[PDB]
């Protein structure tokens, strides 16, 4: 056998992002009816009864009282074919840094847009966040995803054809523009708040006859979300590649001490060898490893686990640090690195000395562009000219930068899950690219 | 403690057991029995360290449970049974008998005896009282009590208890001029003749004893076991005849032995 | 504060950096004791100097 797959959820504010996944987790059997009714009664007093299914993922009290997701959160459930976990996204312009962590620790994704009028238009727009989310998924390494349109119950007429088509074609041509394949991605109509079309075909809407998806591995046909996600592509596992592990968070659990939590990218982690954390350069034996409060003998790649380490404190190791085996090549602090970047949109010109924030896997560090080497054509990596003096949108170039704060990075030619990065500024993804050459301290 | 102790630390064990330090943390801790634990020799160390018949407590337990160890004519399966002073140890499978007697250095020696001598045993009477229906009684230095003794027997005399019957065959009165043995204190294991007895009412009586060589010492009355009529012992004395010789004449004995053996 | 801390490390900053000469390893232990015993107990000098010390700056 059974393979573990990480699914993330991306969408908008009040887009049913947590509501539909609460319905999904209840219907697949992650929680029970008594707990969900307790959520209902807790929502009853302060009137946010629409989000009684959203509170399954919104564990934070501030999240509940504000009605929006602040930080990513995890759940487990077992489908009819394999074992998967799910991460929510905040779905907010401000918490992009929170959601990109979850989308980085992802093997696959689902994208949610509300079908009602007045929300889809703002959802896909220049200020819209669906564009940014779908872009950053491919940028960080979400190879395949699925899309589920939500809240067509609020449409007039509810559950309609033309409303579905006018938006699936728009998102299909957008993902064709960005790189994704509309043929590969499955399109699922779901009524979140009513809880429809997850396990069985809802007979209130018969106009949808089910999607057919084609892919290089094979072909599938789906009618429900479960049928969609039970035929996803199983990702490859770089087990032979040495251990690398970005740390999503660090906890101080009573009775066992400091437990970092992160998703195993490369290599196999098992209790019984020393590891090194790169940015802080500390060496430590691992004591135990554990996924979802269940012990594991090995931590295969693609496993989001919390692992217990000894004789260190919580302050020594923080978010964004990458760990690796000391017996193999140890990850360690990089003074600089060369990246092939693709600038997306910037109101002004980009020159040397520009210091945006580069978001790579879990780390979010401001990096200052040391200098520019050359400009690159959009395709074929074509040499254009040497020594650029300014940069504009829709252009590619080789730029060498040094992070102001200590940061560990890996070249895409070596560690593909660590070579992906994004650049964020003014609440839009200014640049995207990969890392080619890295020096070591 | 909230009750009786049932452990014995290795270093707190009696010195005459000759137990080392590095083999363990604990000592045999002899069970309750006829003799106090300070002056008893448990069978585990008797058969493991004095005779080397066993290498481990498990092996001496196997030997004991196979019912070969007969003490005072009775089979004892206790691994930590307190043997004590001049109890006959009998092994019929290997066909020898042992009498547990202190040496000149105040330690229990491996003393081998003939079966006909082993058939009897000396005891020191510790109290004589009359019980109900006017029945005289006699409690020896063991826990052994007997009824209807000879009325001539008084306190701290010696009696000859033949085994398999437990009755009295003969006795030695505690009298000046009788062969004794010191069963406690510094002079533990010294054979000599009772020469004098000074008695202090309300306190301990001190008896002065001169050995064969003329070295006169003294000891408390409770530490004396009369073992012979005048000067001939009623038992077989160990090597050295209980004559404590000082280190000055022990060293040259060692040198003469080395010279003879080399 | 009076403002006089700015001169911290001044001389250790201005000191020119001259490298250590790469030289032969020194014998250690019994060999070292043998060598320094041989230097100062078995040797004859015909020169005057009133028993000048071992680190004489001649």
């Amino acid at each position: 056998e059974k393979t573990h797959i990480n699914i993330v959820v991306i969408g908008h504010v009040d887009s049913g992002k947590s509501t539909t996944t609460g319905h999904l987790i209840y219907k697949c059997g992650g929680i029970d009816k008594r707990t969900i009714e307790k959520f209902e009664k807790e929502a009853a007093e302060m009137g946010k009864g629409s989000f009684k299914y959203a509170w399954v993922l919104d564990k934070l009290k501030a999240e509940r009282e504000r009605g929006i997701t602040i930080d990513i959160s995890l759940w487990k459930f077992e489908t009819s074919k394999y074992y998967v976990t799910i991460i929510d996204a905040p779905g907010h312009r401000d918490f992009i840094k929170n959601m990109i962590t979850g989308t980085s620790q992802a093997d696959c994704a689902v994208l949610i847009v509300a079908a009602g009028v007045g929300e889809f238009e703002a959802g896909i727009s220049k200020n819209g966040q669906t564009r940014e989310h779908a872009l950053l998924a491919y940028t960080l390494g979400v190879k395949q995803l699925i899309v589920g349109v939500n809240k067509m119950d609020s449409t007039e007429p509810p559950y309609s054809q033309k409303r579905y088509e006018e938006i699936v074609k728009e998102v299909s041509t957008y993902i064709k523009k960005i790189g994704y394949n509309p043929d590969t991605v499955a399109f699922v109509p779901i009524s979140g708040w009513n809880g429809d079309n997850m396990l069985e075909p809802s007979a209130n809407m018969p106009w949808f006859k089910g999607w057919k998806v084609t892919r290089k591995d094979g072909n599938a046909s789906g009618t429900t979300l479960l049928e969609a996600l039970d035929c996803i592509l199983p990702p490859t596992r770089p087990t032979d590649k040495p251990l690398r592990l970005p740390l999503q968070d660090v906890y101080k659990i009573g009775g066992i001490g400091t437990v970092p939590v992160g998703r195993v990218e490369t290599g196999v982690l098992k209790p019984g060898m020393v590891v090194t954390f790169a940015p802080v350069n500390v060496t430590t034996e691992v004591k135990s490893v554990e996924m979802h409060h269940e012990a594991l003998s090995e931590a295969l790649p693609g496993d989001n686990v919390g692992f217990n380490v000894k004789n260190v404190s919580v302050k020594d190791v923080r978010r964004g640090n990458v760990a690796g085996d000391s017996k193999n090549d140890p990850p360690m602090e990089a003074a600089g690195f060369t990246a092939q970047v693709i600038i997306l949109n910037h109101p002004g010109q980009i020159s040397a000395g520009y210091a945006p924030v580069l978001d790579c896997h879990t780390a979010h560090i401001a990096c200052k562009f040391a200098e520019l080497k050359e400009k690159i054509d959009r395709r074929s990596g074509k040499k254009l000219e040497d020594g650029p003096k300014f940069l504009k949108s829709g252009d590619a170039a080789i730029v060498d930068m040094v992070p102001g704060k200590p940061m560990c990075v890996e070249s895409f030619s070596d560690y593909p899950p660590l070579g992906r990065f994004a650049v964020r500024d003014m609440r839009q993804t200014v640049a995207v690219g990969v890392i080619k050459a890295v020096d070591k301290k | 403690a909230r009750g009786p102790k049932k452990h014995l630390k290795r270093v707190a064990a009696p010195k005459h057991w000759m137990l080392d330090k590095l083999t363990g943390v604990f000592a045999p801790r002899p069970s309750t029995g006829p003799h106090k634990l300070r002056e008893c020799l448990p069978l585990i160390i008797f058969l493991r360290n004095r005779l080397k018949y066993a290498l481990t407590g498990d092996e001496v337990k196997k030997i004991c449970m196979q019912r070969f160890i007969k003490i005072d004519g009775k089979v004892r399966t206790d691994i930590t049974y307190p043997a004590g002073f001049m109890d006959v140890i009998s092994i019929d499978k290997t066909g020898e008998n042992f009498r547990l007697i202190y040496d000149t250095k105040g330690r229990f020696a491996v003393h081998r005896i003939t079966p006909e001598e082993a058939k009897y045993k000396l005891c020191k009477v510790r109290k004589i009282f009359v019980g109900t229906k006017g029945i005289p009684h006699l409690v020896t230095h063991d826990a052994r009590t007997i009824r209807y003794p000879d009325p001539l027997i008084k306190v701290n005399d010696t009696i000859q208890i033949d085994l398999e019957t437990g009755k009295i065959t003969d006795f030695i009165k505690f009298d000046t001029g009788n062969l004794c043995m010191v069963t406690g204190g510094a002079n533990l294991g010294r054979i000599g003749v009772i020469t004098n007895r000074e008695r202090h009412p309300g306190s301990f009586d001190v008896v002065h004893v001169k050995d064969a060589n003329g070295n006169s010492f003294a000891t408390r009355l409770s530490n004396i076991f009369v073992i012979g009529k005048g000067n001939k012992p009623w038992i077989s004395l160990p090597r050295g005849k209980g004559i404590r010789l000082t280190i000055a004449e022990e060293r040259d004995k060692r040198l003469a032995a080395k010279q003879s053996s080399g | 504060v009076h403002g006089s801390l700015a001169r911290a490390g001044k001389v250790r900053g201005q000191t020119p950096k001259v490298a250590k000469q790469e030289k032969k390893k020194k014998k250690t232990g019994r060999a070292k004791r043998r060598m320094q015993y041989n230097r100062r107990f078995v040797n004859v000098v015909p020169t005057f100097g009133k028993k000048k010390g071992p680190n004489a700056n001649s």
Partner: protein
């Protein structure tokens, strides 16, 4: 094999455990410590017995090679050897099997069985589910 010699000392026999025990020293002037297997049949030839009742252990080699000293134990009969001899030496000779679980797991099973009272099928099923 060409120059290997067994010598016995402190030899004694006890019928209490029905055996003859001694301390032996073997001289291997230029070779490693002689294998316990080799001592077994060499001492068996020495005492005209078979190399399956022979029991040796505790072989420590003196500094500088040459002599090594161990403790030799020979029985009159293999049934007695099976009866009064440690299970680890029996397993060393292959006559005893220690195919069993860990002490930790055994304690876990005991503590879980403490939680189930009386009921035979549940008390035996206590360790069935949490393997």
């Amino acid at each position: 094999n060409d120059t290997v010699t067994i010598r016995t000392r402190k030899f004694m026999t006890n019928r209490l455990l029905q055996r003859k025990q001694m301390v032996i020293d073997v001289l291997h002037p230029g070779k490693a410590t002689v294998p316990k297997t080799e001592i077994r049949e060499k001492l068996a030839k020495m005492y005209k017995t078979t190399p399956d009742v022979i029991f040796v252990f505790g072989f420590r080699t003196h500094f500088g090679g040459g002599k090594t000293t161990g403790f030799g134990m020979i029985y009159d009969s293999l049934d007695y050897a099976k009866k009064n001899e440690p299970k680890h030496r029996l397993a060393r000779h292959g006559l005893y099997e220690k195919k069993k679980t860990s002490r930790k797991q055994r304690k876990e099973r005991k503590n879980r069985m403490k939680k189930v009272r009386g009921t035979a099928k549940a008390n035996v099923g206590a360790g069935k589910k949490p393997k």
